Design an enzyme around this catalytic site. Structure first.
Site, mmCIF file in Angstrom:
data_model
loop_
_atom_site.group_PDB
_atom_site.id
_atom_site.type_symbol
_atom_site.label_atom_id
_atom_site.label_comp_id
_atom_site.label_asym_id
_atom_site.label_seq_id
_atom_site.Cartn_x
_atom_site.Cartn_y
_atom_site.Cartn_z
ATOM 1 N N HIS A 221 24.004 85.815 103.225
ATOM 2 C CA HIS A 221 25.313 85.661 103.828
ATOM 3 C C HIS A 221 25.872 84.256 103.666
ATOM 4 C CE1 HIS A 221 23.457 83.571 107.219
ATOM 5 N NE2 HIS A 221 22.529 84.514 107.193
ATOM 6 N N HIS A 222 25.102 83.340 103.081
ATOM 7 C CA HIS A 222 25.649 82.073 102.608
ATOM 8 C C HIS A 222 26.205 81.226 103.749
ATOM 9 C CE1 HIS A 222 25.249 84.538 99.094
ATOM 10 N NE2 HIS A 222 26.269 85.292 99.459
ATOM 11 N N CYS A 223 25.622 81.339 104.942
ATOM 12 C CA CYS A 223 26.171 80.651 106.107
ATOM 13 C C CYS A 223 27.692 80.775 106.172
ATOM 14 C CB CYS A 223 25.730 79.163 106.181
ATOM 15 S SG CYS A 223 23.965 78.826 106.769
ATOM 16 N N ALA A 224 28.199 81.977 105.840
ATOM 17 C CA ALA A 224 29.594 82.372 106.060
ATOM 18 C C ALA A 224 29.651 83.766 106.682
ATOM 19 C CB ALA A 224 30.402 82.303 104.764
ATOM 20 N N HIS B 98 29.838 77.999 108.204
ATOM 21 C CA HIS B 98 29.501 77.850 109.626
ATOM 22 C C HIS B 98 29.702 76.407 110.108
ATOM 23 C CE1 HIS B 98 26.700 81.697 109.536
ATOM 24 N NE2 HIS B 98 27.984 82.008 109.591
#
Ligand SMILES: Cc1ncc(COP(=O)(O)O)c(CNCC(=O)O)c1O
Ligand SMILES: Cc1ncc(COP(=O)(O)O)c(CNCC(=O)O)c1O
Lengths: 391, 391
Positions: free
Chosen positions: B348-351, B119
Site C-alpha cells: 500500500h506504499h504508505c498511501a 502518510h
C-alpha cells in the site's frame, strides 16, 4: 604515573587505522569530545552498503544487536528491538522530552536536570515544563565539582517525575554517579533519562547496571558516522510512550519511533564501528584514555599561566579537560594553536549554564581518544607555551 | 512512440555510473520511487568527506547553494540560507506541521490535504488538528484521477489556513497542479506546503514558479545519500515560525532548525548528487524518464490480465505506475518477479487512504529512473507473463 605508563602513552598502536590522521602526522587532534575520527573500516563499510545493498534487513538488525550488546542491553539475547535510531543525541533527547513528558508530567510535577547539562538536555525540558505546568529543578555542584548524595536527596523529592542527568560532562570531564541518582529517582516515582553522548565512547556503559530508563548518545563520538544517534529504553516504557514523530513507517517498538526512510548505510557503519571497538578490546580502550587523560592534566599543571576549569586531579577527568590561559581569550588560544597544528575546542561548548556557574564566558578544551599519543599532548603544551610567550 | 524513441529507451548511456547496477546487469531495478541508486561519484564524495575533513564550513554552504539553485530558489544569488536539512521528507513535514501549525492555526481553522497524500503528509496534520481545534479537509479526485479546479475552489475556502498537497503521487504518478492550488490558497489567507519527495527527482521544481511557501523532499530519491531530507521556505516565514527541535546549535535561519551535529558527510554527498544531475543535463533527464514512463504503460496495456491503477495514458505518469495482476496478490507478483530478477514495490506504499479510495488493498508498482532502459521494462513484462502462466 610510572615510567612504563609514559611508555604506553608514547607508543601509538592505533593512529594508522584513521585515514585523516594517517595522512597528517603533523596534526595533533584534541577535540574527540566534539566528534571522533573515523576508522577506515567504518568509512568503507558505509560506502560498501550503498554499493551492494541500498540481505539488508538482516544487517540493520545485526547493527541494532551489536549496539545493544555494547551497552549491556541483554536478556541471553541482545535487546535489539529496544534501540531506536535518531539523527544524534539532541534528537533522542527532544523525543524523550516530548513523548515521556506528555505521558508522565502532571501539572506541578518536577523535572530535574543537572547544572552540568549540555543545552540539548535543557531546552526541551524547559518547553516540556511550560507546556505541562511543571517546574524545572537543577542539581548543583560542590567544591570538588561533584553532585553529592546530599544534592541528590535534597533536589529529587516526591514531586519529581522525570530526572535527566548527563553521564559525563563535555566540559568538566566529570563522571556522574548515575546509578545513585537512578535509585533516589525511582524512590520518588520518577523516570531516569541519561544523556550519555560523552560517556558511551570512553567508559563502559551497562544500562542494566546503571538501572536507568532512557539512555541516548551519538555514533560520531564513538568512531561511527554522522547522522546516527541511538536511544535505548526499557521495553515496557517504550511500549507505553506516545510516538514522537509521525507518518509513514511509523506500530510496534522500535518502528513506532522511526518515521520515514532511515540512514541504513549509516546504521550499517554504526555497526562496523561498534564491531571495530570491541575488536580493539574496549577495556584496553578505557585504559589508554585514562593514561592520556592523566598525562594531559599533569602536564597542564606544570603551566602556571593556565587554569584548568574543573578538578585538578586527572583521575577524575573522563575524556575532556577545560582550561583557560590567564588573560587570553580562548578564540585567540585556538588560533595560535591551529598555527601550531593543534585542534582544541574554544568557547562555551553549548553548556552555557555550566559556564555561568563557574563564572566563565569561554574556555579552551582538550579531549583525548585512544588514537592519541603523548606527542599529541606535547604539541598542545609546546603550543600553549608559544601562546604565553606572545601574550 | 516513434521508432527513434524506442531507440533512445533502448540505449542506456547511464547505468555504468552506478556500482550496484554495473555489478548486476542481470537485475532490472524498478523501484526508484522508493529510493534511487547511488552514483559512484556520490558514494566516493561522502567517503571523501570523512577521510579529509570530518575547509568544511565552506563546503556545507556550497551544498546548501547547489540545492537551492537546483530548486530555483534564487534572488542573482542562490537562497542558501533558506534551505534546512532534516533526516528525510517525513521529518520536514513533521516540522512544518508542528512549527507552522502552532504559528498559524486558530481553533476552527481548516487544514487541507489531498486524498493522494503519503502518510507523512497526513498524520502530523491530524495531530496538529486535534491539538489546535482545527478541521482536516481532503481534496478528492475525478474520473481521470485529477484534482480539478472545482475541487480546489470548493474545498479550499476562507476557513483554510494551511494547505499541504503532494506534487507527485508515489502511487498514481500524477503531477498535481501545485501553482493552481497555491493561488487559491493565498486567496483564502493560507500557507502552501508542498510535499515534493517524488516530484523533485524527475520533473523540474522551481519554488518561485510554484509560488509556494514550504517545499520538502529527500535526497535518496535523487541519487543522494540516505539520511538527508531538505526543506525550503520563504525567508519571512522561516524567520516567523517557532523552532521545532530544540537544544544545542539551535538563532538565525537556517541554524534555528538544525539541532545537534548534522550529517555533514551526507550533506556533502547531497551536493555531489545535485552536481551530478546538473552535469547529466537535467532536461535530458526529465526527457528520458518520460520516454521510459510512456513505454512501460504502453507495454503494460498489451497485458489484459493486468489492471493499471491510475491513468491509462502514460503522458500522465510521472515516475511511478501502479498496477495489479487480476487475481494475484501483489506480494505473490513481486516474489515471482524477484525470481525473475526484477524489483517492484508491492503493498500500500504508505498511501492507504488513496488505496481505500480506489477500492484496493495492495498494488504492485513499477517506477522508472534515467538509468533504466527498455530491456528493464521488457524483463518486468516477460516476468509478469511468467506470473500469469502460473496463476
Ligand atoms: C553531554 C552531551 N549531551 C548531548 C550532546 C549533543 O550531542 P549531538 O551533537 O550528537 O546532538 C552533547 C554534544 N557535545 C558537544 C561537544 O562537547 O563538543 C554532549 O556533550
Ligand atoms: C509523495 C511522498 N511524500 C513523502 C514521502 C516520505 O519520504 P521519506 O522516506 O524520505 O521520509 C514519500 C515516500 N514515498 C515512499 C514510496 O513511495 O516508496 C512520498 O512518496
Amino acid at each position: 604515573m610510572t615510567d612504563t605508563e609514559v611508555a604506553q602513552i608514547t607508543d601509538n598502536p592505533y593512529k594508522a587505522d584513521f585515514p585523516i590522521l594517517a595522512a597528517n602526522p603533523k596534526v595533533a587532534y584534541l577535540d574527540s569530545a566534539a566528534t571522533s575520527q573515523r576508522p577506515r573500516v567504518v568509512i568503507e563499510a558505509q560506502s560498501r552498503f550503498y554499493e551492494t545493498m541500498n540481505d539488508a534487513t538482516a544487517a540493520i538488525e545485526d547493527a541494532r544487536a551489536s549496539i545493544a550488546k555494547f551497552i549491556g542491553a541483554v536478556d541471553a539475547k541482545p535487546e535489539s528491538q529496544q534501540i531506536i535510531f535518531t539523527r544524534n543525541t539532541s534528537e533522542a533527547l527532544n523525543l524523550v522530552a516530548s513523548s515521556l513528558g506528555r505521558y508522565a508530567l502532571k501539572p506541578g510535577d518536577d523535572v530535574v536536570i543537572s547544572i552540568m547539562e549540555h543545552h540539548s538536555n535543557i531546552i526541551p525540558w524547559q518547553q516540556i515544563c511550560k507546556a505541562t505546568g511543571a517546574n524545572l529543578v537543577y542539581l548543583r555542584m560542590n567544591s570538588q565539582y561533584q553532585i553529592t548524595p546530599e544534592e541528590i536527596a535534597s533536589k529529587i523529592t516526591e514531586r519529581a517525575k522525570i530526572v535527566s542527568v548527563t553521564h559525563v560532562s563535555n566540559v568538566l570531564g566529570t563522571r556522574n554517579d548515575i546509578k545513585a541518582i537512578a535509585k533516589r529517582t525511582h524512590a520518588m516515582g520518577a523516570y531516569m533519562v541519561v544523556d550519555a553522548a560523552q560517556s558511551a565512547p570512553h567508559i563502559l556503559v551497562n544500562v542494566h547496571d546503571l538501572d536507568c530508563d532512557l539512555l541516548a548518545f551519538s555514533a560520531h563520538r564513538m568512531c561511527g558516522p554522522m547522522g546516527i544517534g541511538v536511544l535505548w529504553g526499557r521495553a515496557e516504557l517504550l511500549n507505553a510512550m506516545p510516538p514522537f514523530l509521525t507518518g509513514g513507517e511509523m506500530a510496534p517498538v522500535p518502528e513506532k519511533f522511526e518515521a520515514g526512510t532511515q540512514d541504513a548505510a549509516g546504521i550499517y557503519a554504526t555497526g562496523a564501528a561498534i564491531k571495530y571497538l570491541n575488536g580493539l578490546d574496549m577495556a584496553k580502550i578505557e585504559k589508554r584514555e585514562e593514561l592520556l587523560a592523566r598525562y594531559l592534566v599533569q602536564q597542564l599543571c606544570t603551566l602556571d599561566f593556565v587554569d584548568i576549569v574543573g578538578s585538578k586531579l586527572g583521575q577524575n577527568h573522563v575524556g575532556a579537560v577545560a582550561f583557560n590561559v590567564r588573560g587570553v581569550h580562548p578564540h585567540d588560544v585556538s588560533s595560535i594553536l591551529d598555527m601550531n597544528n593543534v585542534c582544541i575546542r574554544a568557547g562555551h561548548h553549548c553548556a552555557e549554564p555550566l559556564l555561568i556557574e563557574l563564572h566563565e564566558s569561554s574556555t579552551c578544551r582538550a579531549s583525548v581518544a585512544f588514537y592519541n599519543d603523548k606527542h599529541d599532548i606535547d604539541q598542545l603544551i609546546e603550543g600553549l607555551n608559544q601562546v604565553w610567550k606572545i601574550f
